[PDB]
Design a protein around this ligand. Sequence first.
Ligand SMILES: [Zn+2]
Length: 217
Amino acid sequence: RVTTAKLIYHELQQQIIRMELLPGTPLNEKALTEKYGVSRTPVREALIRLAEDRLVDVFPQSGTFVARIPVDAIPEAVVIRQALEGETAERAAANSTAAAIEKLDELIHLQTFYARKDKPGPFHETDDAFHETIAEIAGYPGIWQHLKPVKMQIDRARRMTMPILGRMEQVLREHHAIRDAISARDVHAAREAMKHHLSAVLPDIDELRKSRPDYFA
Ligand SMILES: [Zn+2]
């Protein structure tokens, strides 16, 4: 069931994952309690969970702040995603009806629109929907829900790489490769195009760490 603790949690979590609250931004329990209009109790419960997510840092005699993106865990997150989304890609090709490909094409056209209009936020959200639909076609949409905590730090990094020149267009090219393989029912080609697409995050973060080292730790 929904509680104010879970609702505050998901709201704060989302703001951190979408880089609306940048790393180092303090979080004031007094100011949060006033904002939400509920007790100080559900605020504490949410901050505790966020700390376990490694999303916030509890500096004991200072306060809570938004944590930096841990670099050591990124490669393991890509492998897990390559494996799970490699699976959903394999199965989506096998279960490929034409009405499913239409659903993918509709989402690619929607991404193309956000790229044309240089709106990278909606571009990222339609990116998630594109992958969520691969999981629905494969028959295991829960695999997508399963990855949501895994790809938290990757999503923070990708929020910073999308505005870079030519990046959304590269994503669209990679998505076309994945769709074409699924439409062709090529189980191998689907897996490898998906695993390739997902590896693009690794060089980008190497660059970001040099560029903006205050966002990584
Ligand atoms: Zn994608």
